[PDB]
From Swiss-Prot, chain A:
Subcellular location per the Swiss-Prot or TrEMBL entry: Virion
Residue ranges of the motif YGL motif: 11-13
Subunit organization: Homotrimer. The trimer is coiled-coil stabilized by its C-terminus, however, its N-terminus, known as antigen domain or 'body', seems to be flexible allowing it to self-associate either as a dimer or a trimer. Interacts with host ITGA2 (via ITAG2 I-domain); this interaction occurs when ITGA2 is part of the integrin heterodimer ITGA2/ITGB1. Interacts with host integrin heterodimer ITGA4/ITGB1 and ITGA4/ITGB7. Interacts with host HSPA8/HSP70.
Domain of life: Viruses
UniProt-recorded name of the protein: Outer capsid protein VP5*
Function: Forms the spike 'foot' and 'body' and acts as a membrane permeabilization protein that mediates release of viral particles from endosomal compartments into the cytoplasm. During entry, the part of VP5* that protrudes from the virus folds back on itself and reorganizes from a local dimer to a trimer. This reorganization may be linked to membrane penetration by exposing VP5* hydrophobic region. In integrin-dependent strains, VP5* targets the integrin heterodimer ITGA2/ITGB1 for cell attachment.
């Protein structure tokens, strides 16, 4: 809410100060990436 | 006149040297290991 005004008790995060002093919002976790890549399985090399 | 045969067989060791000489100027063509086998059939994931 903004003081000295009738606009109050609204839910959300206004763009005035989303940082709230905090220098960074952190979220940690795991991430799994099933991808396709270039591997010959050490099977494209010279014979010798 | 049989000596020719006896010499042709006797001096045949020098053949090796000649081959080496003929291999001196010969170009080299070295092969690499080649994949074969049960290559699994992989395709795109269900895409919409």
């Amino acid at each position: 809410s903004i003081t000295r005004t009738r606009v109050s008790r609204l839910y959300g995060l206004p763009a005035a100060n989303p940082n709230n002093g905090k220098e960074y919002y952190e979220v940690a976790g795991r991430f799994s990436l099933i991808s396709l890549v270039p591997s010959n399985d050490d099977y494209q090399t010279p014979i010798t | 006149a049989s000596l020719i045969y006896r010499q042709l067989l006797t001096n045949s060791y020098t053949v090796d040297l000649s081959d080496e000489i003929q291999e001196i100027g010969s170009t080299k063509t070295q092969n690499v290991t080649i994949n074969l086998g049960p290559f699994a059939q992989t395709g795109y994931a269900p895409v919409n």
